[PDB]
Structures are given as structure tokens and as C-alpha cells.
Amino acid sequence: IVGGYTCGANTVPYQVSLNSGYHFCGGSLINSQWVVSAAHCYKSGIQVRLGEDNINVVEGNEQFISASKSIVHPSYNSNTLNNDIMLIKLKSAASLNSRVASISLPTSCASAGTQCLISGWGNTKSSGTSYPDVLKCLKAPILSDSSCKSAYPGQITSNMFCAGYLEGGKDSCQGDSGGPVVCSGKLQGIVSWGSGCAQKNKPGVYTKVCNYVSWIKQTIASN
Ligand SMILES: [Ca+2]
């Protein structure tokens, strides 16, 4: 997250870190056994880390649970990033509490102008490179489809939306991939892609989660 703030320990209780020897992506806990992330975060050997603040220090509220299976969306295209969503099942159910909690799926799509919370352990620099140990947060509005498409000609599908600031300065970045965009207590987005970070007229692009609620529910119900 570039131009954000330190969230505070365990203040975003649905935020997970995906770890394969090191943090490589964010995710969102949606029930005791399932995490939603980006399809471009797919790899084998995933351990889900819940209750994290400082990802380099064991602080006492963590749960480390190996993934038993991952399910990339059937229509995910890695070239265009259309349908950039994946589900990860935990080998055992997380113990849910005030600091490890699921986030509700949307029942309807959120509108341009809706204020959301974006979070992650990604790069905090737009030019250089600096990775935080503690979770960073950004409050950002959803941008209109027209402004999103104008920012990225030929690249925005019906499964994507822009959030952030056309002036730049505040954005998601490398390492935030797969993490949450939460608006009014609902998971509306997944950190998907952008052109650099916090650049003028290049806001972050997010997977439009409301399009996938039926797929998420039916997949969970049979796996
Ligand atoms: Ca920790």
C-alpha cells in the first residue's frame, strides 16, 4: 500500500497473508474454512496465516493453517487477468474470534463513489521499494466505469473496477495482490493489477467480487 496508514494490530480481522516460505499475497477469510484471493496468486505449498499484524514476528494471535486445496476460477485468463479470483480451503477450520473473523460476501455490487478499505503488506513506495512488516490500510473510493476505462483503454472488463485516486499518491502495490477491498462491511474487491503504483491516472484495478458470489457459494457447498 502506497500513501496509506498503519492499520493497527488485528483491526482488519479477515485479512490473511499467504505464505510459501515468505509472504507473497493477501487474501480474505470468508468462513472458518475458506479464503478468497486473486487467481494470479495461485501456487502450490500455500500456508494461510491468519491473525497477523507483523508478518516477521510471532505476536500471539496468529493461526497458521496449510491449504488443502486451491480452486482457480474456471474462466481465469492470466494474460488479461479477467476473472482474477481463486478460492483456498484450509486443512482445518480457523478458530474465529474478534481478531480472526470472516468478511461478508456482497448481496449487491457497490457503486462508484462508495468508500472502501484496502489493506495489505505490499510495497509502500511508488518509485523505490520498501516492504512493511505491519499491515497497511488505505481508504479509497470506487471510481466510475467510464473513468476506469479511460485510464486503461482496452483493458477493463465487466469483472473489474478501479478504486483510488486519479491524482495518484495513494494506491495498492506489489505484494498487496489478492487482498481485500471492503466497503460497508462487504468484500467488494480483490487486489488484482495496476500500471506501477500510485501513478497519476493509473489507479489500482480490482476483481469485481459481486459477480462471483454464486460461484463462491456453490463451490464452497461442494468442496
Ligand atoms: Ca506475526
Regarding whether 91 and 108 lie in a shared domain, the answer is no
1 has which bridge partners?
none
**Domain range for residue 117?**
1-12+103-210
Cα–Cα distance, 7 to 114 (Å, whole number):
20
Pair 191, 18: CB distance under 8 Å: no
Write the DSSP assignment of 163-196 as a string of letters.
Answer: ES-TT-S-B--TT-TT-EEEETTEEEEEEEE-SS
Question: Is 115 in the same domain as 73?
Answer: no
What backbone phi and psi angles, to 5 degrees, belong to 217?
Answer: -65, -45
Phi, psi of 67 (to 5 degrees): -75, 135
Same domain, 30 and 70: yes
Distance CA 129, CA 111 (A): 33
Judgement on whether residues 121 and 205 belong to the same structural domain of the protein: yes
Question: Are 35 and 68 part of one and the same domain?
Answer: yes
Distances (CA, A) of 198 to 47, 139, 168: 30, 14, 4
Do 136 and 63 share a domain, yes or no?
no
Query: Of the listed 28, 40, 73, 192, which one is catalytic?
Result: 40
- What was the resolution (in A) of this experimentally determined structure? 1.7
Cα 9 to ligand 1 centroid, rounded to whole Å: 10
Ligand 1 center–CA 79 separation, angstroms: 34
| Count, residues in the chain | 223
Verify whether residue 195 is a known catalytic residue: no
Task: State the number of CA atoms in the 13 A half-sphere of 83 facing the CB.
Answer: 13
**Catalytic annotation on 222?**
no
* Residues in CB range of 96: below 8 A, 6 or more apart: 32, 102
The answer on 85 and 160 residing in a single domain is: no
Q: Is 1 in the same domain as 107?
A: yes
- The answer to whether residues 167 and 187 touch, using CB atoms and an 8 Å cutoff, is no
- 150 with 193, same domain? yes
Residues 137 and 170 in one domain: yes
Task: Flag whether 57 is marked binding.
Answer: yes
| Residue that the C-alpha cell 479477467 belongs to | 82
The three grid cell numbers given for residue 202, joined into one nine-digit string: 493509473
Residue with cell 495461485: 42
Residues 98 and 119 in one domain: no
Asked if residue 15 lies in contact with residue 179, where contact means CB atoms within 8 angstroms, the answer is yes
> Cα–Cα distances in Å, from 118 out to 58, 67, 73, 138, 218?
24, 24, 22, 5, 26
Distance CA 151, CA 134 (A): 31
Give the residues across from 191 on adjacent strands: 206
User: What is the domain count for the chain?
Assistant: 2
Collapsing DSSP states into helix, strand and coil, what is residue 79?
Answer: coil
Q: Which of 32, 41, 43, 97 is nearest to 65 (CA)?
A: 32
Full 3-state SS string of 91-156:
CCCCCCCCCCCCCECCCCCCCCCCEEEEEECCCCCCCCCCCCCCCEEEEEEECCHHHHHHHCCCCC
Residue 32 and residue 127 share a domain:
no
Which entry of 28, 37, 70, 177 is annotated as an active-site residue?
177
Q: What DSSP line would sit under 1-55, residue for residue?
A: -BS-EE--TTSSTTEEEEESSSEEEEEEEEETTEEEE-GGG--SS-EEEES-SST
DSSP 210: G
Q: Are 109 and 207 in contact (CB under 8 A)?
A: no
CATH of the domain at 193: 2.40.10.10
Rg (CA), the chain: 16
Question: Are 104 and 29 contacting, i.e. CB atoms less than 8 angstroms apart?
Answer: no
